[PDB]
Structures are given as structure tokens and as C-alpha cells.
Amino acid sequence: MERAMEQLNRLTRSLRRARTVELPEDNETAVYTLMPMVMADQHRSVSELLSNSKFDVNYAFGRVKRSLLHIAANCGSVECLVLLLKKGANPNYQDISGCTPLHLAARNGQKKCMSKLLEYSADVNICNNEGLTAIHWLAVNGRTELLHDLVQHVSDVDVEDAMGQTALHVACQNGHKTTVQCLLDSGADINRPNVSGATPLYFACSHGQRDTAQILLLRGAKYLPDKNGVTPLDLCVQGGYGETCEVLIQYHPRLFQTIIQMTQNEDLRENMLRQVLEHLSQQSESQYLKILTSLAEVATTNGHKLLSLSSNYDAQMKSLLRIVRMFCHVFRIGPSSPSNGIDMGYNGNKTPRSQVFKPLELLWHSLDEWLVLIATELMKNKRDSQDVISMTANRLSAVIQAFYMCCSCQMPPGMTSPRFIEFVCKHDEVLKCFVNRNPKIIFDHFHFLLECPELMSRFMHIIKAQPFKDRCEWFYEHLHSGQPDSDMVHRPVNENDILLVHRDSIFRSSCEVVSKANCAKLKQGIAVRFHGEEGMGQGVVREWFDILSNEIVNPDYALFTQSADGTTFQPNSNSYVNPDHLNYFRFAGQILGLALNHRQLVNIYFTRSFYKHILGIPVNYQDVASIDPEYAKNLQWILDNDISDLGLELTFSVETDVFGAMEEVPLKPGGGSILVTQNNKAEYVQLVTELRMTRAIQPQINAFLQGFHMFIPPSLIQLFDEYELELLLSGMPEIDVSDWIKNTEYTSGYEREDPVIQWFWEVVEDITQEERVLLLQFVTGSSRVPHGGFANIMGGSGLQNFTIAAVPYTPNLLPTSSTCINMLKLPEYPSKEILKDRLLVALHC
Amino acid sequence: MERAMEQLNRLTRSLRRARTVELPEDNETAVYTLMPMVMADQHRSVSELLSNSKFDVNYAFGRVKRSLLHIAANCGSVECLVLLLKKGANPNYQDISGCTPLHLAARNGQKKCMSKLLEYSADVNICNNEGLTAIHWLAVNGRTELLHDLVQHVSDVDVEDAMGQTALHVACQNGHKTTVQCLLDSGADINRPNVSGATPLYFACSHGQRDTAQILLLRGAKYLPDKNGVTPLDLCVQGGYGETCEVLIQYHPRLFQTIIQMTQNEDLRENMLRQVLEHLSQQSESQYLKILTSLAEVATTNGHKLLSLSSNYDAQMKSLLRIVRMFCHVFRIGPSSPSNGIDMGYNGNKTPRSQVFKPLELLWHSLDEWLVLIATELMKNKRDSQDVISMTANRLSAVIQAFYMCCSCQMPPGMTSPRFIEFVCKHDEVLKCFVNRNPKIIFDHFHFLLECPELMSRFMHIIKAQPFKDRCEWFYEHLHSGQPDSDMVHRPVNENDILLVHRDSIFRSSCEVVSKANCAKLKQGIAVRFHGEEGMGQGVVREWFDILSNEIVNPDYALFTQSADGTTFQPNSNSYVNPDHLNYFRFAGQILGLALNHRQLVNIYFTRSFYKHILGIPVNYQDVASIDPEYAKNLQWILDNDISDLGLELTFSVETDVFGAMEEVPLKPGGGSILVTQNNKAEYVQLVTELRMTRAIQPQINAFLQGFHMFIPPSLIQLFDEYELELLLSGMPEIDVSDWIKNTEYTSGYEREDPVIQWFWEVVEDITQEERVLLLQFVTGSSRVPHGGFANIMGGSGLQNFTIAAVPYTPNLLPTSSTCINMLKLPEYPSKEILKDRLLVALHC
């Protein structure tokens, strides 16, 4: 009969909202309704008509093949969970990844399921095929409360992955508290060696969990190395964190010495040691002393042992520096307080210096014990001057580097001790005797001993004591290195190495651009752009300079002029008319400052005065000649004469006919109140020159350098000679001896028939280009022959090719090059060997 | 004798600082010392020993060949300037560019030089070979003071470039005051026709110099067109500035009408007219009226003249809109005050409406005079229904577009007048009769008449009145256009169309990404990136979606489930457990929202309910069947029966067994206090359904759409049918009739021997793909056959290939597809033509 509808007649009336019929005859259908309702947490609904059914739970679903009993892990359906277990189940199934509802409850954080599951039970000691246990699952997650609420059910703390890790091994690898105390309360093993022999502790010293480690050593946790032999402590280094060591050392003060041993080694990136020592140094004064004290002893030891001659030059030496460099750095931060860094409040100290520095004093005394002998040895070796000398020199070279390092920190910034100088006072001989052997060297050991101008304030001395001929291939080092100082050999990078130029007004526009940027972004071969247009990288860069190669010397802002030669330039004294000029002078040197760093020439060259004022020299007498010959020619006549002869005196105040005013102005205060002494003849005119400069040069020159020194520091340049200097502004010349032969002019009734000229050419045609280029400028001032060759020489005004001038000028005297006359004046030597020998004496100087 | 040194013996003593000897015997030397000293402004120094010399000034220098007399232009060396002119000179030389020291003094701003030069004189009427005169040089620079101080020397104001420009022509082309008044005071010509006939005034109307123009028309400056015939006034338009016109019209009120004539034209970018009219409208109320009034008359005229049938469809129509569109825009800014914009303070007005709108009223009355007849014509044409009809329709179509434009501005935003509706009330017949002819059209004229839902709040009406068969190639328009609404056919661009994804957590990561951006940046086929890695543009984009094609339907956050069919999805009702879900639902639609805009499928498809809740439909009865058959099967049995039969009633409060509570809850307040009426049988269960939805669907659905509508507005979609909808989510299917033939299942003791099946296939194999795809889903619900073909069908649970079912089900009735049974139930038609004809009646519906 149709009474089968009667159950539904109840369902429709009052249960159709909640439920359907449990007679679809497919277990897959049952999940298609229950799978929500399980997750609905419909506690008893699941049972209501399920009271009739023929579908057991051991059948599962999904590609996982997972039962709803697993699913109940998710939403906390504890009542349905029980309802399932009234039906029965084997919860720790062979799930696809070795999982189980228990693990999944933990992941879902349903407490009561874990409880009610474990009011029943199924073995937890099981694992995933991926490795983990229930307990390990919780340890990484650090799921404390359930995990403490879990231990009551379970027997063993020997639980392990098949790999062997315990929960204990996890919680410090991850970093966590509570997992400790429970298992400590449970009585687990503290050393519990891994398969590799590692320990729970061994993790933490990789980690930085200072506080647990404070508990464990309190708890009595043992210290010991790996099965391989390494220590825990080598790791807390590479973790960089030092309070964890500070915690460690409260439990083991013994090991403080070990760090002094860990630094002798060389396996490390040294910087990490600084992190540690930086911190600890700021953890006591009494520490801070004993630290430095101990270091010096090591330094002192290795110092002696570098002089233990068998020591390799590599081993001891590198060990040394790594102690010293920090030692220098530590003193910068400086005398610590207990538990704290540098002693605040009181700027002095408790007289540490002897206690800390005594081990040095023996080494330096020991150094002195060698060096003082050594001066005797090489100096006494008078008739006769492998090289143990050069060997031992190198060993000491490291030490010589120390003597700046040890010394250059207990002084304000930049300033040196005269104690350094006193060292030089005794050993000056030997010091020359090294560079006598080692031209190759300065930028390695000595690199900074030069660098100080306050030492070069004397040690200009040795810079000259090494003469010119050695400087050539190291004049080249500044080219085929970067500048061999490492900040200049090296080029940085930045995310925006780009500048945008406005094309029609590059002279003022670039001033608006480059002023709007900072040095470090610009200390690089940066690419350049137009304003709103690309420029093909290097292309616009070529355009940008070589346009500025015009704009700079164009009278675009009333800025420069040509000197008396023509074919060159010198700044206009009158550029103070328009006050922005200094912004252009600062700008000017910056632009050139790039030109040399990245080493493409400029299509400009300048007179001699300008290079000289840059490079820092007091300009000599004869440079005057390019200003006006009628001035200089007659001053030369004065250099023969004295006050006794000429029957005239200089009024030491003269009409400073400048700025539309014959400004009566003295030579000098005090200088205005004297008459000419015979000694003064060149000396005031030097001052007239400098005072011919000061009116426009002095402010403007400084403005120019301060823009210039951005891109090269002033002191790298001290090698260079001003004559050679332009070669990086212009490249080497094509030495055009061929076209030179073509247009040699001759005077004094004079043509190549003269054997003097035959003897002349015979010397010329064996001369190095390193001297031919000098002679070219020595007599022209300017350098470059035009594009076609030496025939293109125009003399500025009238095509005066170069002239060779021999005259009855005394053989007892040296030449003078009538420069803008494009001429060199020479004495007629009597004979060949006299010419061939003494013409060299004439020309080299 | 050596007494020649005596002059220098004075020089050294007291003049060597200031001077040298003037005997170098080269005039080029003299410049090499003086060229500074000239610029030094050494007033008298230049003369001192120059008193003896043999070098005249007419010799010059540089590639310019320029004298120091020119150079004195620079620094104001008036005394030296005179000193030169004591020596004599011809200052207006044939300089290289036709220049002269006078021009150069002006450029350098040295007043006295200009004075002292012109205490002497040389003809200023000369010019540059580049074109300019002295006076023109000053005009552009606007160098007033010297220029006023200049006129006293000079005779003519007829001065001109050889091109013919006067100073007067310059100063307004550039914009400047003072040059006017001086020459006005001088008595220059105000019209002064150029070679092209242009005038000084003619420049200003290109320029915007309102104030001079205020002076000139005050001064009596004449108005007149070009030699070509164009006006000044056409330029002040394209300069966009209107007060200059406002200045103009104070002097010429007559021309106010001309702008009404300038807008009829079509040479212009219309926007500039808005700039003008925007301003002027805000320059009086009485203006503001007369403006709109005049416009309507033009509109009214052109309106009639569009109905002057000879008018081309292009000309009058475009003229119209350009009046109306502004007219609409003007009212937005709205009723102006005198001299000012919109009347502040009082939100009403002075009753403008009839005065402004009357010209419309005739046109619309005139429109009504046509349309009311026109309904008669086409409707009375009853036996018999080129096409002047379609022609005149198009003409009116423009007008029909007006009727929204004229109407949709005196109302708050979005809302319409029922006056519009009243128009439809009379003309509904004709309105259908157009689209009856014009399927092709809506997005051109009507585009917005649809767009209003408040009009579609009725005009849903005509959207259905046009039936399905027309929608196919315009269902395709949304594909082979963008969406044919222009904002969607068009894609914007931005400088950063880039998003950065984090690869291992794309589901939550992308939520962190896309929430961190704004719509307009994202309304584009934007490229995508990984976090710290590139992704090959389209590649990661494919990866990003097609990973999300998994992540979305993965139970990754407890979000979706599979529906009863399997092989599809529906949202989990239980996703309210974890409150961020709405952020994912909003997120969800956004992600899909891109998928359709840029038209690559998703590797997902959904059930029918989900599409229906999206698209805005009230879900029908039979969609229920995918939820539970045991529910739906028995409700079907109820649809045969009524309260009279079944002997049962629904308790209108039932156990809402949800959230672990048999929540006794009514059907509805008021619904809970009734018993079943026979009419109610489907009606409450609809409400049960919607209330089976509301518990989870209602909040979540809205969250999903609000993320979705970002990338398509809701109303573009109103064309679509939900069945066809998925094709843009999945692409068209490979219609696999071949493999379909291979695995056709058969039941009711039934195999292809039956002629019914022969008659079946005979109909099937002529069916369009546009209907075959429907039938596939009509009986499967799901769409896609797996990769290998129709043989891969798995039925979800048990490989139930599709089944064809014919039964003694009455021929008087239509099919029902037992869908997840993969079956279609059909009546056995008695004969072939009955099958061939009436099976169509069965299947199309």
C-alpha cells in the first residue's frame, strides 16, 4: 500500500526542513547530505532517521578516501563524532599520508574532540609517512594547551620520527617555552642524542632562544660537541647574537677564553665577530679591559711568531690584522662601563692605557730591537750594498702598517701622534731603502701612511726622495687601475643612475640638473637622458660633454677668455660681474671630475697656470711669460741686475687700476713701508703675481676645486706632474715626427747644412715619446697638432711653424724656449760628442 | 741710447701694475690687452699710453670680425666708448648678422651707452639680416624704459621688418602694455595691415591679452577679417579664453549672436566652445537665460530642418546634438546669477522654465504631430503591412535620443520624469515597429534609454517583446566587440599596469594584492608579476588564474562544496564559520570579473542556481532538483495534488535544524498563522527555497556581486541567458556528435531497431549547434565532455553515459529531463510526421 508515504507525511509536516529519507540505497548519497550536516554540527539530526540504515563508516570518500569521521575533526561535531563511534570505527586508518583524525583535530584546534577521542583511544605513537607524529605536529605549531592536556593519555617520551627527532629537538629549533617544562616535568632526556649525535641544546645555539637556554643550563643541560666534533658555540657565532652567549657564560665562564681562540681561526666571515664583540664590550668595563688585554697578547704572540722566520707570510700576517682592525674599531666605540657601552658622563677613564697597551710596547720595543740593528746592517754594508732583506722587509711591512693602526685611534680624527714621527726620526734610512727595492707597493701596506697630509706635511719628503723615473708605470696605474685606491678602482651601483638633460640650454640646464642630485648616486659612470627624450646611453653622454666642451669656453656667460697664445683658455678675471659664476665654477669642476674618473678626454685644453693652481703648486716665475711678454721680457732683464745697478726703486704701493679705479694699494702691510732690497727682486713680483691672481682667482679657484674634489679626492693626485696631466684630458698625441720633419723652421742664417742640425736630428730620432711630448709643449705650451698634422700649425696669428734656434749663447748655460714664438734657443756646442752629450744636459732639465 | 728704458722706469715704479708699453707693432696685440681692460671699465687707463699708437678701431677681431667698440656694449664702458669715438668709427657696420653695437647694448641693458651713442648717431632704421630692428629687438623683450627713452631720437613709426611686422604687431603677439601707449602717443597706425592684411588686434585675439584689447577698442581700434576672410574672433575661440571676448563685447554687443552662429559650424573641436560658454554663462543670469533661449531656437530650427526631408541624415543631426549636449551640461552647472555662476543662497529660480523651454515644446508638439499620425499609418496598414518608413525612423531616432537628453537633467541624478513614460504610453506600437526593423541599433541611439533600470523598470517590457532569436549575433556583440558600450569596448592605459603576486599562497596573497589597488588602474588587461620574480607577462597571468581555478574550489578555507551532481560546485552554506570569507567572496567576483572582460575561460563551471542568483533572477521550482531528488521528486507529486487530496498540512513553523539547533521558526510572520490553501502548494516552497538560501546566500551573494560589478556594470548583462552564459567562462564545446553516437544508452526495452530512434536521429542530425549545446546541458546540467570525448563520461558515481528514454507518457505532454540520471524522458509519438513535427514542440521549449 501507499502507507510508505506516511513517514514523509510527518517529514513534510514537521521534518522536511531538517531531513530527507534515509533510503537512497547508496552510501555515496548518505555523504552527499551528511557531509554538510556533519559540518553543520547538527548534533542529533544525523541520528534521527539514520537509526535505520545499512551504510557503515569504514567506507570513505574523495581521492583522499577520507571518512566523515575525519571530517568531524574540522567543525567540532563531538556529538556526531560519538554517534559515529556508537557505530564503530578504526580512526588511525592507513590514511594516504599516514594521517588520522587526531592530527586533523589538532590542526583545527577542536579541544573536546581530542578529549572525547581519547576518552576512547587509538595509538598516537603512530606517525605520518611524511615523518611527523601528533606530538611533533604540535611542537612546531607550539600548540601548548592541548599538548599539555595530551600527555596524560600517553606513555612514552621516547617518541621520535623515524629520522629520530624528538619534540624536544623541535621546540628549540623553532623556539618555544612550554614544550620544555612539560617534558621536563615528564622527565625526558636532556641530551637525547640524534642519529648525528646532536642535542636539543645544539639547535638553540643555531637559533638564538636565549631564554630556554637560560632554563636548560639551569636545568643542568650538558655541553658537548657534535659527533663530527664541532661545538654548539661555533653556531651562536654565526647566529650573531651574543646575549645568548652571555646567558651561556653565566653557566660557563670558562669559555670566555675560547672566543679568543675562535678568532685566531680563519674559517669565518670576520664581521660576525664584530657583532658579538660589539655587544659584549658593552656588557662590562672589566670585560672591556680584559678583552683588549687578551687580544694584545694574542697579537703579541702572533707578532713574535711572524718574526718566527719560519712563519709563512700569509698565515701570521692575516691573523694579526683581524685582531688589530677590530681593536681599532673597538676603541672608537671605546671605554665601556659595566653591563653597558662607552662610559657616559665622564669623558676620561680609569687609567687603562698601560695595562691594555703593554703587550704592544714589547712588540714595538721588539720591533725596535730589530730595526735599529737593521739600519746598521744595510748602512754599514758600504763597499758591497736570495734577498732575505726584501723578505724580512715584507714581514715588517705588515708591522709598519700596524704602527699607524695601533697609533691612529687615541687621537682626534685625522690627527697623528708625533710618536709616529719619532719613529721615523730614527729609521728614515731603512724606510727609503725599502721603496728603493719596492716601487710596486704603496697601495698595499703603506697605502694610508701616504694618505695623511699631516704626515705628508713632512712625508712629502719621501715622495720626492723617490725621483721621477719610477713614477711612469704608476702614473699609468691611475689609468689601468681606476685610481688604485679601492674606492676608485671600484664603481658603485644604484637603482637610478640616470640624469635628465634639457637640450637647448645645456650650460644652465645641466647646472639645474646636477645640483639636484647627491654624490654617491653620481660616483659612477652614470647614464644620461634628455628631458623627455632618450639619448642612446653613451651617445648623449658624448654629446653632453662635447657640447659642454664648447659651452664652457664659449663666452656664453662672460666666463673665460683666451690667453695670449690663443688656442687655449684661462678664466676671465671679470667674471665676478655676474654672481652665479661660482655656481658655474663649482659646476665646472664637477663636470670635469667625471671626465677623468671614466676616462674620456675633453675637447679643451688650458694653459699652465690653470693646471698649477689646481694641483696645489705655488706658480713659479717663468709661467708669467704667457700673460704678457713685454712684462716678462723686461723682468728677465731685472733678474740679471740688482738694486746696485738699475738706479730705480719700486714704489711698494702702485695704482691698482682695476674696477675703473687707479686704486693706490700697497704691496703688503709692512711691505709698503720698505724700499727694494737686492734680494727682493723676484720675491715681490712673485707677490705681485699672486696678487695679480687673488683679485679674481682666489675665490673662484676654491669654488672650482670644491666641485671638483667630489669625484677625485685631492691627495690621489700628488703623484702627477702638471705636464703629463693633460694626457687624461686629451689622450696621448700621435707623435707626428714625420710632418714635424716636414716643416722645421730655422734661423740665425741656418739650415740643415749645419752639422749642429745633423747632430741635432741624430739625437732627436732616438728619444722616447715620454720626452718628445714634453719637448713639444716645452716650446709650444699648447700640445695638439691639428687634424691634418704638424703642417696645420698656425701660430695663433700667422702660420709660424716651429723654429730651431742656435746662437753664440754660452755653452756654459742651458736653454730657454721662446714659447709663443714657437722657438727654442740653444747654445752652439763646439763638437759632436759635446753636442751629443751636453745637449742632453740642456734638454732634459 | 738706453734711455728708451726710461718710460718703463716710470712704468715699473708706478704704472707697471696698470699698463704695459704700447709698442708691440701688432693691432692684434692691442686687443690682447685691451679686450679685458675694455671690459674692465678702466675709463681712462685705455688712453694713457694709447695716446701714442698707430692702430685704428675699424680693424676687427674674432670669426665675427667684431670691434672692441661692439665689446664696449657689454660692460658699460661709456668713457672708453667715447675714447674710441674720439678716434672715430662707423658703428652700424656690416656685422655678420646685420647687427651693431646699439642692438648689443640693448641686449646688455646699458642705458648710458645707448644715450651717448645717440648723442652721436648712426641710423637705427637698419635691420638684422635675420629680420629684426633695434625697436623690434626691444619689443619682444619688452624693454620698456630704454625704448621710451629711445623714441626721441628717431623719426618713423613706419619701421618694419622686410617681412613687414611693426613693433605694434609684436607686442600683442607677445603680450605687453607699454609699447602700446608710447606709439599711441607717437601716433602710429592702429590697423597697419600686414602683407597678409592682418592687424595688431588680429594677434591679440590669438593671444589672450584682454587688457590691451580693453585699451585699443577704447582707443578706437577697428574690427575686420583677414585678407583671407576669417575673423579675429575665430581665434579667441581657439585660445579658449572668454573674458577677452567679454572685453570685446563691451565694445561690440552686436557679436553675441555670432557665437550662436559659430556653433552651428562644425570645423571645431566642440570642447573649446564649452570653455567659453562655461565662463560666459557664469557672467550673467540674464545672459544665462538668453543664451539657452537662443540655443533652443537654433535647435528648434535645425530640428524642423531635420524634418525638412531633403536634409541629409548627417548634417542637421550632428548640428543638433552639439547644441543639446552642452545644453544639458549647462543646466548641470545651472541657473546663473549676474556676473557669476549658479545662483547661490536660493536653490530655486525666477521661473525660467517656460521661456527657456517653449521652443522645445513646439518641436515635441511637432514631433507629436508626426508620430501620432505615424502610428495610424503603419497600424492601419493592415492587409499589406524604398522604406521611407525606415528612413524617417532614423531621422526621428536622433530626436528620440533627444527626448532623454532634454528630459533627464531637471531631475535628481538617475531619476526620470514620468513625462517620458506618458510619451511611451501613446507611442508604444511604433516603438516596437522600429526595433522590428532595427535589431542592429540599440547602442547608437537608444543606448541609454535601455540603460536606465528605472525605465527598464517597465522597459524590461520591450526587452522581452523582442524575442530570443534576434539576440544571437548580439549575444556575440558582447564578444566580438568588447562589451559594445564604449567604456568597455575601450581599454584605458596607465604607467603602472602591474601587480605583484606571492607564489606559494596565491589564494590569500592575491587578496592582499588586489585589495591594494584601485579600479581604474585595474580596468585593463593588466600584466602580472611574482613577488620578486618576473612571470613572462601573459604566462603568470595564465598561471595566476588557472591556479586560482583550483584554489577557489579547493577546500582551502572551507568555502565551497560540490553539488549533488559532482563535477561542479556551489558555495558552502557553512562558510560563515570564518569571518574573512566575504573578503574572499568580494575578491572572488573581482577575479572572475577580469576573466570575462579579457576573455579567457576559467577551468571551473558551476550549477544553475549560482548563475541565476548572479544574473538577478528569482530561481524557479525545478532548479531545486539538483539539491536532493528525494526532496524534489516528492514535491513533484504534490504538484499534481492539492489540499483536497493529500490529507495533510504543512506546519508553517518547522524545525530549522541548523547551527546545532532544531530552531522552531515560522515560514513567515503572518505565514505562520495560516493553514495550507490549495493555491499555496508551490508558493510557500518557493519561499522555503529562498529561505533555504537566505541563511547563507543572501549576505554572501551580495558580497560576491559587489566585487564582481567592478569590471562589468550590472546592466550590460540583461541580454544574456544563463544557459549561454558559461560559454564565455568555458569557450564553445567541440560538439562531439561522433563519440555521442558511440555511447548512446537506451532503456524501456529499447534499441535503435525502434523507428522512433530512427526518427529521433533523423531530427537530431540537422540541429544547429546553437541548440545541440542546450540539449547537452538540458539533460546533463554540466556541459563539458572530458578531454578524450563523450566516452569519458563518468556520471559522477558510475559511468552512466547518456540515456534516451521513450515511454507511454502521453503525446499530449512535453518532456522532463531526469538530469543527474543523465536521461531524457519522452512520449512515444504514434507516427513519423507526428514525431518529426511534435518532437520539435517537445524539445525547443
Numbering used by the authors:
A (entry chain A), B (entry chain B): 1 to 385, 442 to 901
Paper text:
HACE1 (HECT domain and Ankyrin repeat (AKR) containing E3 Ubiquitin Protein Ligase 1) is an AKR‐containing HECT E3 ligase in the “Other” subfamily. HACE1 is composed of an AKR domain at its N‐terminus (aa 26–252), a MID domain (aa 253–522) in the middle of the protein, and a HECT domain at its C‐terminus (aa 523–909). HACE1 is a tumor suppressor E3 ligase that has been reported to inhibit breast cancer cell proliferation through 26S proteasome‐mediated degradation of RAC1. Here, we report the cryo‐EM structures of monomeric and dimeric HACE1 along with in vitro biochemical assays.
Through 2D classification, we identified a G‐shaped HACE1 monomer and a circular dimer in which the subunits faced each other in an anti‐parallel orientation. Global resolution was 3.9 Å for the monomer and 4.6 Å for the dimer by gold standard FSC using a 0.143 cutoff. Our cryo‐EM structure shows that the HACE1 homodimer makes two head‐to‐tail contacts between the N‐terminal AKR domain of one monomer and the C‐terminal HECT domain of the other. The N‐terminal helix and the connecting loop dock into the groove of the small N‐lobe of the HECT domain. In the dimer, residues Arg13, Arg16, and Arg17 of one monomer interacts with Glu705, Tyr687, Glu712, and Thr707 of the other monomer. There are two interfaces present in the dimer which constituted 2421 and 2418 Å2 buried surface areas, respectively. In our HACE1 dimer, the N‐terminal helix and connective loop occupy the putative E2‐conjugating enzyme binding site of the other subunit. We hypothesize that obstruction of the small N‐lobe of the HECT domain could hinder the binding and activity of the E2‐conjugating enzyme, thereby modulating HACE1 enzymatic activity. Consistently, the HECT domain small N‐lobe of the dimer is slightly expanded compared with that of the monomer. Superimposition of the HECT domains of HACE1 monomer and dimer reveals the movement of the HECT domain C‐lobe by 17.2° which in turn causes the catalytic cysteine (C876) to slant by 14.7°.
